[PDB]
Amino acid sequence: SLYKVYGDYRSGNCYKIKLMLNLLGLPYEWQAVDILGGDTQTEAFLAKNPNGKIPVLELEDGTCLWESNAILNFLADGSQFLPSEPRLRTQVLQWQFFEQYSHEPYIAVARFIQLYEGLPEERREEYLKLHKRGYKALDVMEKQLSRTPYLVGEHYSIADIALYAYTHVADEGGFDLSRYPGIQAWMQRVQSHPRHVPMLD
């Protein structure tokens, strides 16, 4: 009612918003969008996000906010999930831009190729390159989480939420997280939050 999400629960970018809404106890309606079925290419959808992607968060007055990581900032602002100190707020945004530039296009797309398309031969060379670049991003996270328990110091924030969404299913794109015990112990910490919800119910 206060919030309406247009989304697909299987999409890591949309899972970020399901998780944030539940962690904050905020009420929502979920409108399932079928991207293969054409739902993001209609004019009705493009009026909500001209970039043609989910998730979209629609507010009570009809205003539509898009980009999953910008939606996390809107929901979290003033909460314990988004620091107000400029250096710490900047570090949270650093991990979020890093997630959109250096991580998502390798982790999410490898998972699409393998889980959604069954790893076709025609995409195998592409897939192996995504593996090399995705592992490079997991290596960055492993070094940080070998030193602090969340990406930004001692406090769970929307940087962790942004990176947990696809990292927790990186095995579905053929990444072997047993190589990353610091990532695995962080996934455990995220998942231990008393209001945590899984991607699928």
The annotated binding site for glutathione is made up of 40, 53-54, 68, 166
- Interface size with ligand GSH, residues (CB under 6 A): 12
- Does 157 participate in binding Na ion (rule CB under 5 A)? no
Among 4, 13, 165, 199, interactor with ligand GSH by CB under 6 A:
13
Rounded Cα distance, 31 and 47, in Å: 15
Among 69, 73, 157, 167, interactor with Na ion by CB under 5 A:
69
Helices (H), the chain: 12-23, 43-48, 68-76, 86-98, 104-111, 124-145, 158-167, 181-191
Stated as kind and residue range, the H or E segment containing 30 is strand 28-32
Residue 82: exposure state from Cβ atoms within 10 A (0-12, 13-18, ≥19): buried
Minimum CB distance to Na ion smaller for 49 or for 69: 69
Amino acid at 190: V
Among 69, 73, 96, 167, interactor with ligand GSH by CB under 6 A:
69
- Does 99 participate in binding Na ion (rule CB under 5 A)? no
Binding partner selected for residue 103 from Na ion, ligand GSH, none, CB under the kind-specific 5 to 8 Å limit = none
Binding partner selected for residue 35 from ligand GSH, Na ion, none, CB under the kind-specific 5 to 8 Å limit = ligand GSH
